[PDB]
Symmetry: C3
């Protein structure tokens, strides 16, 4: 009954591990962002919110508002989901597409699913995650950063 | 019952203000395009049309056809919507994602919604709009241009 | 009842014609990829699979697994679709957006539709295809490669 679309990108820099779909992945560099740069969750939240017609992470997570300043993506997703259910919506299914030249996400997909299908209730079958390489082409191909696109569905 | 997806990008150049979602926004440069470069509406039209399985703005708005030569995006959207209803379709909901490093769209989102929810009938709640920065990464990050992605849904 | 999203890109190089949507298109260069670089079908398969929650072409088409090593995109799509129906899903509609500076896809859209609406059963009306230029902007604008995005829907 309601469709949503999210999109988000983040740039590299900072040694430490990166976090995607709530999973800590080892890698040369880390992701910037003044919040743990979880492009996957951020794009997922935006999809969900955009389908409920509630904004785009700037309603709960602005940037200069003491409401939700320092918090990880898992908390925001969880908060965003609460407001969405407040408007009487329930999850149908969500599909997430991660775009990066490296590192390899294939081995982490399942753990990501577990996290996501946990912070939204629902069973894993209602959550899909996949990654794509881009073939060393754009800013993602040159390893300058990482991007993610997501879609979602709601009800009754 | 029917899903659609649109995508569109435009390059900068030309002083004058830019137009996005039908709103006149102030900015250093303007958008090229041989039609007011309204990436937002163009991507929205394509979504709607692509869900109705009627093409991609080249059915009503080609480029070398005296049918709809000089016209703004609002007219084309409005025309495209008419043909869509002709095939007996009605709007479910649409979500638009604008991608740009600047200017800030946040303050114009609501006015955009008003315009869109006007040229498609329906109430604002069936139209969502959000913007994202890209973090100074791709051609959008370098300020070379602006892009937009959109999804939609129809019926009965 | 189930939404899906796909995305895929490929780089140029290799004289010979390119293949998109199963159609052989004439052009200066060809597409790399260690499989016929059919970005259109690959993105379409991923959408369908991602909506059925079955992966992302690495379940049927890995890279180092003698299962489905050398095969064109039409075979994989056809195989992927079979497994999808195995889980009791049926096609609702799909929309594909091809992104490239050249060559012109406009004249091939219909033949692509015929191929797609053949390997998925269903009538053409359940399959949409469109192309966009990008305005000589990103890696697609510089002619370095070609990309494709797709969405889909399933049932009962
Ligand atoms: Mn982010
Ligand atoms: Mn345009
Ligand atoms: Mn591919």
């Amino acid at each position: 009954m309601r469709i949503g679309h999210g999109f988000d990108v983040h740039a590299f820099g900072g040694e430490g591990p990166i976090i995607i779909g709530g999973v800590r992945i080892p890698y040369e560099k880390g992701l910037l962002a003044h919040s743990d740069g979880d492009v996957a969750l951020h794009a997922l939240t935006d999809a969900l919110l955009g389908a409920a017609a509630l904004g785009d992470i700037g309603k709960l997570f602005p940037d200069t508002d003491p409401a939700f300043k320092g918090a990880d993506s898992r908390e925001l997703l969880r908060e965003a989901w609460r407001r969405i259910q407040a408007k009487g919506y329930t999850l149908g299914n969500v599909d997430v597409t991660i775009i990066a030249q490296a590192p390899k996400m294939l081995p982490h997909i399942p753990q990501m699913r577990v996290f996501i299908a946990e912070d939204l209730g629902c069973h894993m079958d209602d959550v899909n995650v996949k990654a794509t390489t881009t073939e060393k082409l754009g800013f993602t191909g040159r390893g300058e950063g990482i991007a993610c696109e997501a879609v979602a569905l709601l009800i009754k």
